[PDB]
């Protein structure tokens, strides 16, 4: 039940939606790194007008998020969730811009079929099996045995299996998803360890601005290989 100004500055609200703002329900993505489905439908896309209209869209099986039907209105969809609407025949993708806000991208089924997800941790689960945890809280059982931490994975999204992976690399272009230099698509050119907590990388854009961002806030997107269509 937070106010419209206490809502974060990256899912935008104008002077229109009242003094209050919806809170995202608990789910895969975080609270402050989130776009709820009602803000995506009626405050960003404007396929709806009111809360009851958004409910009348959501309750019938017309909005699918990451390939599954998401019914509740304030479902969290933070980063790179393909959002398939079949009556309009569109699939939107959530990326950022250079200023630090949410951006929507229209696309069809060929790029809508896969999800590029960053690995959070690799472990040995119960049954003596290695399993893999992404930032979408997707756990994949029996992964490829080189996919370590901070590697990204092309998730199939019709079975959910691994298809390809991109390694953490000095020389692979990356996207920033946090910090004071948030949302700046550039190339990882250096990486400093700082063992004892909070190591960094040094990263430059396409046009020569060096800056240091933390290896938590980084997010690998591809060496050149823009596997998701960043908007031209």
């Amino acid at each position: 039940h937070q106010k419209r100004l206490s809502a974060p500055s990256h899912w935008l609200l104008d002077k229109l939606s009242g003094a209050y703002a919806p809170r995202p329900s608990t789910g895969p993505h975080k609270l402050r790194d989130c776009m709820p489905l009602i803000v995506f439908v009626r405050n960003r896309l404007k396929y709806a007008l009111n809360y009851r209209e958004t409910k009348a869209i959501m309750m019938q099986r017309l909005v699918k998020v990451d390939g599954k039907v998401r019914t509740d209105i304030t479902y969290p969809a933070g980063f790179m969730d393909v959002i398939t609407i079949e009556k309009t025949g569109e699939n939107f993708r959530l990326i950022y811009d250079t200023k630090g806000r949410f951006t929507v991208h229209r696309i069809t089924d060929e790029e809508a079929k896969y999800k590029l997800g960053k690995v959070k941790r690799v472990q040995l689960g119960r049954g003596g099996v290695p399993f893999l945890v992404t930032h979408d809280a997707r756990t994949i059982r029996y992964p490829d045995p080189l996919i370590k931490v901070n590697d990204t994975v092309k998730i199939d999204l019709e079975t959910g299996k691994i298809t390809d992976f991109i390694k953490f690399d000095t020389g692979a272009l990356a996207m920033i998803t946090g910090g004071r230099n948030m949302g700046r698509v550039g190339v990882i050119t250096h990486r400093e360890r700082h063992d004892g907590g909070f190591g960094i990388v040094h990263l430059k854009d396409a046009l020569d601005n060096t800056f240091a961002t933390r290896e938590s806030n980084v997010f690998v997107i591809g060496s050149e290989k823009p596997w998701i269509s960043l908007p031209k």
Partner: protein
């Protein structure tokens, strides 16, 4: 930077500024004129009523308490169509911006006047 921004648009930048047709910026049968700042807000209220076309409440008691108190603490005044700003801190920025923005032919004549004996004497 308020007085400085209007100097560029009208004297420096070679681009014509949209002027309203004369009777359009009159509020309530003449009771006020809409200044170019207050007019630009009024389109922003209107340009939000065709996007998803839900109507608005024409202000409320809690916004009118705020914006009419803004006149109480400001030295602005609107004598005509224009605004007349006070000469306080808005004048000091004009000085404060401009300080960071500022941060062998001779010898021949001598031998050509040393050759001829002399022209004449004192008349």
């Amino acid at each position: 930077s308020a007085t400085l921004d209007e100097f560029i648009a009208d004297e420096v930048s070679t681009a014509p500024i949209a002027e309203p047709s004369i009777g359009t910026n009159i509020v309530k049968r003449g009771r006020g004129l809409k200044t170019a700042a207050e007019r630009r807000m009024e389109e922003e209220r209107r340009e939000y009523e065709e996007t998803n076309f839900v109507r608005l409440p024409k202000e409320s008691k809690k916004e009118r308490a705020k914006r009419a108190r803004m006149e109480g603490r400001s030295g602005r005044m609107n004598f005509g169509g224009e605004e007349f700003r006070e000469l306080g801190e808005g004048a000091e920025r004009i000085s404060r911006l401009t300080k960071a923005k500022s941060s062998g032919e001779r010898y021949q004549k001598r031998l050509k006047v040393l050759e001829s004996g002399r022209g004449t004497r004192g008349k």
